[PDB]
Structures are given as C-alpha cells and as structure tokens.
Nucleic acid binder design. Sequence first.
RNA 1: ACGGGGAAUCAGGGUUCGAUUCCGGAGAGGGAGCCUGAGAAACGGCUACCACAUCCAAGGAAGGCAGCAGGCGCGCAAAUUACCCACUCCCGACCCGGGGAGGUAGUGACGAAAAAUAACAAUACAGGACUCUUUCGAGGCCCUGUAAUUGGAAUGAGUCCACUUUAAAUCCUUUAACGAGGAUCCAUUGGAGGGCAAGUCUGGUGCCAGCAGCCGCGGUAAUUCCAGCUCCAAUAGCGUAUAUUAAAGUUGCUGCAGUUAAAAAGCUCGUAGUUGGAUCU
Lengths: 141, 59, 56, 180
Amino acid sequence: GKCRGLRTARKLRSHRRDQKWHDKQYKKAHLGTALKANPFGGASHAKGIVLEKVGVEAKQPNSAIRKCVRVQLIKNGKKITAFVPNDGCLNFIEENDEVLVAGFGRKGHAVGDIPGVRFKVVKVANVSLLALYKGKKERPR
Amino acid sequence: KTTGFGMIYDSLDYAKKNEPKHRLARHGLYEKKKTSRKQRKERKNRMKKVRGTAKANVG
Amino acid sequence: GSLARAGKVRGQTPKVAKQEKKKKKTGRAKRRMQYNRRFVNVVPTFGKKKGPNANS
Amino acid sequence: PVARSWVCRKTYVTPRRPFEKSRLDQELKLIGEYGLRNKREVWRVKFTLAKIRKAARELLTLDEKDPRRLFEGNALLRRLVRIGVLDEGKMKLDYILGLKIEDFLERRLQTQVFKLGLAKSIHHARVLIRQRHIRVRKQVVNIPSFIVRLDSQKHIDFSLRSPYGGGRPGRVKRKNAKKG
RNA sequence: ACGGGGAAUCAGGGUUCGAUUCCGGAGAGGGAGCCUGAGAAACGGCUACCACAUCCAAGGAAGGCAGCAGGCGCGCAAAUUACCCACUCCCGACCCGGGGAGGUAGUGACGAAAAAUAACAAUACAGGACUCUUUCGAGGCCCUGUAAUUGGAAUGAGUCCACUUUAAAUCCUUUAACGAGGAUCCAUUGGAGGGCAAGUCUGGUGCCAGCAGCCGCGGUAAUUCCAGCUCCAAUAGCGUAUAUUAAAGUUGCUGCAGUUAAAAAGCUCGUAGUUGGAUCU
C-alpha cells in the first residue's frame, strides 16, 4: 500500500520524481538527449540545401516509390531525407535549392507508408510548394 | 453634439502669459522659428567641438 | 530507382475548365439559406436515406 | 515602458466536439431565429451565460447569511432585471441557473427592432441598424449586438436624419428624381 | 535557470511557462584597477591587459549600440536613419533651457474587441401547412426556394470640399458632392470510407502517380488519387510544423497497479524515516 501518514510528504514526492522518470514521455523531454539528437534542435522548421533526389520504396503491405529529397541543413550541418508531398512536386525541385523543411506530425516517428522519414517540405527557394502546385506563383531564377 | 473645452481670460495680457504657446499661434499671436530638431541638434554638437570664440561662428 | 514518373497522373488528366456559375452568398445570408434549407421546408420522408448530397 | 493598457478578454469558447448533429442543428436554429452572422455570435452569448451561471454557482455554495453572497448576489440579480431577463417576482439567486441562451437574444437590438414592428424581417432589422436608421433616445446605434435595457426599450425610433424618420432621401430617390 | 507580482490550462486535486513594459538584482566586448562626488568600482568617465577594430604623411592619434534609429551576420523567428517636447515627468543657477526618457505617426492577419459581402415587394411556377370541398379541385392565410424575371427603395467600401483632430498633421468621429443589378464593388481555407459533418455522381489513371495523423485506399465501376459538378465546417479567416496543457484514474495526495497481461526483494535481522492501544471531568 501507500504510506499515508502526515510526516510522509518527502517520501511521496521523492518517490514521485523517481517514478516519473519511468514515463516514456517525461524521460524523452526532460533528459534532453532526444533534444540533442534532433536535427532541428527543438525548432519547428528548418532550412537546408538539396544534395540529391532519392526515391524511397514504400513499406510492405502496399507499394509505390515515395519521392524524397536528401537535404543538408545549414544551422548545424545535419543531413535529412525529407519528403516532397504531392504529385509532380519533385519536378519543382532542382539540386542546391533552399528548402524550408518541416516535421511530419508524429514528432520523430515516420508516417506509416514511408520507412524512416520524419520531414516534409514547405518552401523551395522562398516560394511555397502549395503556391507552385496550384500555379499561384512560379519558380524563379 | 460636440463637446470641447474653453477658457475666457480677463485680459489679453494674461492670456499671452497663461496660455500654451501653440494656442497663441492658432490666433496669430505667436511665431515659432522654422528650424527642425535635427537642425539645431546637429548644430549643438558641431559647436560643442569649438573653443570659446568661434562657437558663435558655427551655424 | 527510376524517378521518371513524377507528374504522370497530373499531366495525363484532360484539362477541364471550371464552369462559369453565379457567385455564392456570404455572411448571414449564407446562413439564412441553410436555416430555410434544413429547418423550414419539409420533404415527406419515411426512411431517411436522402442525404444532403444524395445523388440517388 | 509605454502608457498603454494591455488587457483584453476573449468573448467566446470553441466547443469540445467539432461535429455532432445534435449541436450543429441546435446552434443553426438559433442563427435562423435571430439572424446571426456566424457561429461565433452563438458561441458568444453561450459564453457570457457560462460566466453568469458559474458566478452564481459559487454564491450558492456560500452561507445564506454570508455578506459577500448578500451583496454580490443582489447585484447580479439586479443586473439581469435591468436587461429584461429575469423578472421582479423571480429575482432570487436560485433562478439564475434557470436561464437559457435565447433568454438573452430576445434582448439584442437586432431582435428588438423586429419584435417592435419597425423591421419587417429579423434579417431586415440587421440591415437597418447597420444602415444607421435606429436610435436609442438620441443616439444612432450601429451595432446589432446591443443589449436593450428594460427602461431603454419603450422608446426606440427611426434616427431623425434617416429617410424613414425625418425624411431626407438617400442616393436612390434623389437620382430617380433627376430624370423626370 | 535572473527571482518575484503574474500567465496558460483546468470539476476538485494538479501540470507547465514567466527573455518581456511593475519591484529587486546584475552587466555594459572579457577581466581588473581607479579619479570626482553625498552617492560610482560609473563605462554615452579614466587607466592598463586580452580580444576585436578605425585614421595616417608610419611619427602618432582615436574606440565600445545588451540607448533610439539603421546596417551586417545569424537564424524557423521580429518594424522608420520619420516628427515633437504639446502631454507625463525628470534635470539645471531655472515660470523661460534641455531630454531618441517619453509622446506622435510609419511598418504591423502576434494577439484581442465590434463588424459588410445584401434587403424588401409583385408575378412564373414547385410547392407544402390552415380553411371549403365525397374526391376533384378551390382559396386572400402562411412559408420556402429556382427565376442571368420584373420593381425602385436603402446603403456603405471608394473618390473627395470643408470642419474637427493635433506641436503640425494623419486615422477615427461630423458633414457637402459623386459612388450598386449581378460573369460587379465577383470570400477562401480545408474536406466529403470511418473516427468526423458532408456523394455509393461523372471523366481520367490502373500497385503506377498518389492519398492517408491512425485503420487503410490504389492491380479496369477508385465513395479515399488527379480533375469537373455537387454539399459541409469554420468564416475575414483557415490550414500545417513544433513546444505545452486538458483528455491522462496512461504518474494516481485526492486517485493507479504487481497470480496468469509489465511487475513482491531468496530468506530473516536491523539504525535512520513513517506509524503507534486503553485510560487523567
């Protein structure tokens, strides 16, 4: 059972702050090595230069070639395989382009079709891919 | 309606004393010199560099 | 491997232009339309299989 | 440091469940009964009544002879009688919890133009008030979301500069007279 | 990790943030040492050292924006070399001078408040309720739609005198004149298998291209892709990424569990810690 005294306050809280390190969420946040291993450094977005365009074959229960882009970030020099979302949008991307890279939505976990990709793409050379896919703006040079 | 403020002096000599000097210019009873703040504050720092005689020469 | 199929199904569609049509209403008159549309007039219905976008 | 004041509320709360037919249908009836613009104008009155009821909850928890309940409660019971929501016979703090949303929207100016027969539709009234044809005793009111006080009701009229009250016509009747 | 006042979130308990306009602290590139003064270890004062860096006739001399502007760099991430001492106050010998303190404009979809994008009437029908009628049908009693049908009524957005505003302006308010019939004064962001509101529509593609937070969809009728039409959710906003809170009674003090689902030390002793029977009007 639980110690249910009155002078038992530090037995409770020194136990709580040890059994809270066995939470997976808490230990990921507060230990701060996930934060160190994250290439964004806890940032929402980043900004990098394309090194090449890499097709990524999808995971087993279905089949496709998910079109991805091997970027290298500027602020720390990490390298990333970021995912270009829509169809024909890989044509919008040359090598050596400024790419605003965001996260995907599962915060370090890949989204189910794609093996090991955390990172979608928002802008290419300061114009957004939604503007290029819908023709509202055009690729500059 | 319109609501405003108003003050009635006893003599115009008092009104030339007890009034803020933009409300004398609104009746043509005052003239401001036409130099902007950047004009004299440039001049103040130039004449700050001169000794006693020629500080009046800098304009 | 091969990246050559990128905008295959995008470019292979026949480009249809959107139809010229009158403008919708906005503001509360759009909300005026829906209240009349849903809660004022009654269609005599016994099974309730008529969805709002029910193509049969 | 500046001389500004940074205080501001938010006057609505988005609901917990986005899509449910029992709630979307029940909001949209009140839009259509009372001519509201969007769902935020429903989520606003529902939020003010969520505060009036929550303040009256903590007064009911206190002692019945607690002076904080006797003073602050007799103010809240007073402030609802003046905007015509509770009544004189029902001015007890138990009855504040017996209030509904459309108890309040009967007292919006948009509806009180219509109920008085000035406008010929609940939608025609939101026109007129924003069209600056409505005055409260001397004051052209340009907002439909205007809670008419109980003494402030029996005289609301046609804003003497208007074509309806004092009768100088607008652009249209002038230009039609410039032809014949 | 500057600390509080505080903020977000909450049934109750709680969790998280507080670089940031109020109070206290600290530092003016990093250290150190001083002169003056009532008050400084002052940096819009000095002296050195270290690191940067300016001018030059090469001998020398002059620095310190984490002040207001503005620039470079850095980044996901942040504004004008504007005007004024008129307000608020401060300083000085001082009713009189000065103050990038501060105020006023500019940039400003951080965020918050109010709030347009239509309204009414008559006909064309379709309707559908109340009434008469065995039904038929009739109604002047209502309501709804489609009317690129008619109809003049009311308008702001905008252009713009003047007044007001103000230090001088601007904005707002106030008022002349002009300014509304639908491809114009044209509302867009997401979606339509489920969760989750709303198509078993049409055309194309045919494990491709793609969608999809999750489950899944896609291999010739694809309700899930790419398009058209439709309709639905919010609405001057609405998507996405990330941190965080509730959901989480999945951190449990309230309030969790430990036979078999993750889990009780092999066994006892034992100091600290925790808890301790009555009984004293």
